[PDB]
Structure 1
Amino acid sequence: GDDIYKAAVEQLTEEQKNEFKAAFDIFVLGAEDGCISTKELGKVMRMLGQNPTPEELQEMIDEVDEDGSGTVDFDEFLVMMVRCMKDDSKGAGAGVRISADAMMQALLGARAKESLDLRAHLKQVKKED
């Protein structure tokens, strides 16, 4: 998507990228093509307590899709986070949007030390374009 996203995604280090990589693993755990489809997408979101749809879920991935095959990979997933923090990609309205920290809350795990702390919740951004 927007260069601002890619710039940040690539800027991420091995540690930062790993934090998100894990979430992707559990997301596409035993997938058909190791990708995130509407099936796994909603199946994971609902876990948090959501009730999306097969027609709406497609809009999410489609918006965060690169090739437009109807799925999201790791490299693409990261872009969803960088943009999520900004909240520019999409907007709530369908009952309850999804946050990078939320969607991952189920993947990585309920407990968390980073999210818990306020300082380790979110850092500034330097995307001078």
Structure 2
Amino acid sequence: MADQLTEEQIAEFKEAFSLFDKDGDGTITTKALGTVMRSLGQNPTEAELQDMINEVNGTIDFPAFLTMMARKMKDTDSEEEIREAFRVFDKDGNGYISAAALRHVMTNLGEKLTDEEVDEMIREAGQVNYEAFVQMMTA
């Protein structure tokens, strides 16, 4: 969906779109999608653009441009969501968390997890590293 982004990327993206829009229609050419992304720091090579117009005629409207930035931002955020989700598990932050620490903080997180689900969770996997916890979460 598009609720993954806050207000403040969307108000910035309409700021970039209405700056280089042609006549206020909400239209840009297949050149201007390149210059509107390099105006904000993001510098993709032309293969990254080449698939998105194939994924959406020559008229790139503002809901089409908003959906392409949402997929361009969510893939790196879905790859990096899980490390900061791992940070409250260990006290130091290198990735090493105790097994005795993990049965009171993971049964109390608010998804109605009982004592039985985290007991299945850790014995289908001392202290375990960080990259194994992605290996055991995504499965």
Normalising by structure 1, we get a TM-score of: 0.38
Q: Which has the higher contact order (CA 8 A, sep 6+)?
A: 1
| The structure with more radius of gyration | 2
